[PDB]
Amino acid sequence: DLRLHLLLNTSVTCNDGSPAGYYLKESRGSRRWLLFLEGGWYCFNRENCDSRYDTMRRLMSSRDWPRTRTGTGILSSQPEENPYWWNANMVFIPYCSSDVWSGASSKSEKNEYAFMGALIIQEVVRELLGRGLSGAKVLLLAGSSAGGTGVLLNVDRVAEQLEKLGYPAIQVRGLADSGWFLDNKQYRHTEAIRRGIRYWNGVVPERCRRQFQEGEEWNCFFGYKVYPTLRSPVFVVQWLFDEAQLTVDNVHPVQEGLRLYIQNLGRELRHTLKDVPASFAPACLSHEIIIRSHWTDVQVKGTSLPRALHCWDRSLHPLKGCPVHLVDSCPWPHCNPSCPT
Ligand SMILES: Cc1ccccc1CNc1nnnn1C
Numbered sequence: 426d427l428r429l430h431l432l433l434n435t436s437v438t439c440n441d442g443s444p445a446g447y448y449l450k451e452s453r454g455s456r457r458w459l460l461f462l463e464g465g466w467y468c469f470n471r472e473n474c475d476s477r478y479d480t481m482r483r484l485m486s487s488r489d490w491p492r493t494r495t496g497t498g499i500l501s502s503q504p505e506e507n508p509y510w511w512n513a514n515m516v517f518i519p520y521c522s523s524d525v526w527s528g529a530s531s532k533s534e535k536n537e538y539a540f541m542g543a544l545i546i547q548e549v550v551r552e553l554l555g556r557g558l559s560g561a562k563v564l565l566l567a568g569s570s571a572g573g574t575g576v577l578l579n580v581d582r583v584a585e586q587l588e589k590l591g592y593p594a595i596q597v598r599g600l601a602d603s604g605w606f607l608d609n610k611q612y613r614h615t616e617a618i619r620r621g622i623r624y625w626n627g628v629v630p631e632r633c634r635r636q637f638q639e640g641e642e643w644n645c646f647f648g649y650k651v652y653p654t655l656r657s658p659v660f661v662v663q664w665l666f667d668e669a670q671l672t673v674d675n676v677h678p679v680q681e682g683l684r685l686y687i688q689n690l691g692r693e694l695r696h697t698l699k700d701v702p703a704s705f706a707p708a709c710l711s712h713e714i715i716i717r718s719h720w721t722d723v724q725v726k727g728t729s730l731p732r733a734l735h736c737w738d739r740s741l742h743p744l745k746g747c748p749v750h751l752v753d754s755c756p757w758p759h760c761n762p763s764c765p766t
Pocket residue numbers: 465466467525570571574606607608609615646669670673
């Protein structure tokens with residue numbers, strides 16, 4: 426089990442002003458550290474956030490969090506469940522800021538809620554340095570869904586933070602799962618993100634900010650636009666037919682118009698990954714994520730995700746029999762036989 430620690434700096438808070446925190450399981454024989462960002466959509470105005478506080482309160486507050494959590498999938502310490510990093514130091518950072526991990530705004534007399542996702546990540550890193558992170562060789566910042574987009578928005582800031590604090594030997598890398606979205610046309614008929622950024626005082630990576638300029642920071646929430654601006658190594662996991670993408674696209678006996686729409690979506694996603702050398706993109710319709718216990722089962726071209734991640738580790742020391750760029754080319758959901766059932 427991973428044990429809860431509420432942040433010692435209690436001014437770094439969840440939406441309702443309660444302290445943020447992290448769950449930790451140490452592995453003293455390892456210099457690898459995995460910091461995982463939870464997902465769960467976002468909220469973008471007072472009324473929408475009030476609704477989320479009524480029925481999704483754990484995503485807005487630490488008041489009811491349990492003392493422990495079980496590590497699963499890539500967070501499991503069992504070699505059979507996690508062939509990749511079973512012996513690593515494990516950290517799960519709960520998502521309680523509703524801001525895609527981008528915010529830097531406290532509660533005040535003018536703000537009902539605090540949006541501190543970017544500050545939560547930096548404070549977790551700072552407090553872990555005194556618990557053994559100072560001796561790390563690799564810090565892998567991973568996350569799923571909104572947490573996968575959070576990786577893209579925060580990995581370079583973590584690298585800069587450790588350099589400025591005096592830890593130049595720690596290699597910072599990112600693993601973005603299910604957070605690579607397209608700003609495409611809906612099947613049946615970006616603004617919420619634009620409103621959200623203003624509501625949150627949201628921040629984006631500096632090189633991406635300088636390309637798109639004032640008012641256009643929303644562009645940096647889209648993987649294919651922010652990824653080329655990043656300096657840290659980043660591995661991208663993305664289903665070609667992601668269920669969250671299809672939900673925003675208003676897709677739910679398929680006739681020609683919808684067949685062409687779905688085929689074009691897969692082709693567009695595959696195109697955006699052509700120049701991403703570390704990636705795993707199976708041709709599946711799914712909402713499943715990398716902390717599930719059976720994450721080992723899917724394969725692309727005969728290679729599993731735990732294997733591809735191991736090959737990525739070797740590449741950062743091409744490799745015979747150890748590939749890192751794995752994107753399906755078949756054009757319809759479940760044309761890969763290993764897709765989750
Ligand atoms: C970045 C993020 C994080 C969580 C939930 C949604 C989103 C962006 N929304 C969106 N826009 N076009 N497709 N999708 C899914």
